[PDB]
Assembly symmetry: C3
Homo-oligomer: 219 residues x 3
């Protein structure tokens, strides 16, 4: 059931918050404190999201099905900080950070429209959102990777691992969406919740630990 996974989510993120929060405190230097604090805020925003969803908030019947539009509201706050985990580690220039957050915000706003609009109009917005996502796929794979690798020549595998894990994780969201009742409806309203909660935990708690491991490698 959706409630069990929303609750699984509530505890997962809150426990991710405590872990990073304890790392934020007793941190070695500024570089380490920032990274631990970025991941602390990400998991706090997510714990907040899951707490509201589990208590029946942020949901409404849209086109005959329960829709947790609150996901867009909070994803709009955590995802720029997830992209900040990458740019902070890469020591990326601000114009490239601007582009990433730019294309990220675009993706969520048009992604939100596809979620609240009926069929077949929703497919247009899905396509537009996927294109904003494919713009992000290019930026991380080419300008971001080339700049981070020149700035860290002995750690080309760290950013290679960062980007690939970021690509696998973020690509499964439009896959879940188009297979859920929003698209082709291959599975129920309960599976959508489960898939999103496992994806969210991995994309924030899981990625959190990866970026810290990535910093250990850089030294």
């Amino acid at each position: 059931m959706t409630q069990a996974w929303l609750w699984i989510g509530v505890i997962s993120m809150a426990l991710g918050s405590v872990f990073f929060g304890f790392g934020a405190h007793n941190a070695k230097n500024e570089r380490w404190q920032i990274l631990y604090t970025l991941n602390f805020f990400i998991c706090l925003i997510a714990a907040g999201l899951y707490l509201a969803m589990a208590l029946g908030l942020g949901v409404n019947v849209i086109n005959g099905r329960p829709t947790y539009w609150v996901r867009f509201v909070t994803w709009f706050c955590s995802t720029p900080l997830l992209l900040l985990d990458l740019t902070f580690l890469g020591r990326t220039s601000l114009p490239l950070t601007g582009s990433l957050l730019g294309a990220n915000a675009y993706m969520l706003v048009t992604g939100f429209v596809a979620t609240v609009t009926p069929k077949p109009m929703s497919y247009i917005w899905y396509i537009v959102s996927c294109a904003a996502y494919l713009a992000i796929v290019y930026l991380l794979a080419q300008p971001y990777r080339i700049a981070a690798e020149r700035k860290h020549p002995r750690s080309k595998q760290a950013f290679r691992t960062l980007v690939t894990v970021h690509l696998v994780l973020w690509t499964l969201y439009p896959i879940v969406w188009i297979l859920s009742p929003e698209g082709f409806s291959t599975f129920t309203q309960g599976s959508e919740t489960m898939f999103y909660t496992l994806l969210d935990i991995a994309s924030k708690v899981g990625f959190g630990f990866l970026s810290l491991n990535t910093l250990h490698t850089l030294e």
Copy 2:
């Protein structure tokens, strides 16, 4: 169904036993033989547990629901050896080993009471068990980590990885418990089985391979 996962469990642990048992035999030295044998015994105890549960043993109706109390009986034997995987690798002093096994045994006995007592009395014992667990969280994170790192200065990341994977894995057991019919009952009696079988396989077969990889790093 619970039966499919109990059977998934039976084969998983038995195959973990063969793998470590074959490693126990044809081992390089004493340090390697011990580690392979520790993990061999852990998986044997677990294969035994799952074999009894699958055949309908160690279960009884407690407060109106099937309860596999046999989990506590066998967890009481495998978990001290899981903690021995850490202390053997860290080359930890005996007083610290005493403390860990001490607090581990406490956690399972009070954890067992919470499992067999009705609501709301069960919540008291859950809280006490969680406190015995939080005592373990401190011991691994602070005295254990500081001693293992001084004894191995070039492998601070090995014990860092050991402890974190040990923390993530062991924390999900009280989460499963409090969400199952024992606590807030967010999910069925079938999901509890599934979650525990995936957790057990990871905490013994999965952790088994991690500790061997941790020894490879130490050389």
Copy 3:
């Protein structure tokens, strides 16, 4: 439902194809192009398989249950290339490649018979197929590992990781089979699909990324 997982499979492999195909193009040298192309073909064969299964092809009622015999048809093409990922990396001699592909082909043909024959005759063919699989377990663990380690003395952990991940992944297929309606029928026709789709994705997309990481280590 089976349809949701078959569709999950269709997109997973197709996205694995694009990733490796883009790696195949813009590759550093011949050693890198070959590896990226091997994994590109593997995922293409798998995307093809899942596309046919999702559209209702390659299935027929055998002994009173839907049976996707098409799995054997395509597994017969992808698995020799999965074994080629190992031998290409190990720089293995052709007689050992011959033996592996030999025993692999045997396993699938007798494995296919067990799938299409009734009970209890099916158990004989299962046993024969498992023995062809245990012949593969020996070849990878002993002749393959000893040759790859002499040819790469500073990367004994790369092939150690290759083989173990290959063993864990490939062993779960006869476990799924014997627990499914083909054997002891512990779970439904829907769980069999799900388990096979998660196993296939890991054994091709997952293993694909591992073998590339293994090449990075070799340099």
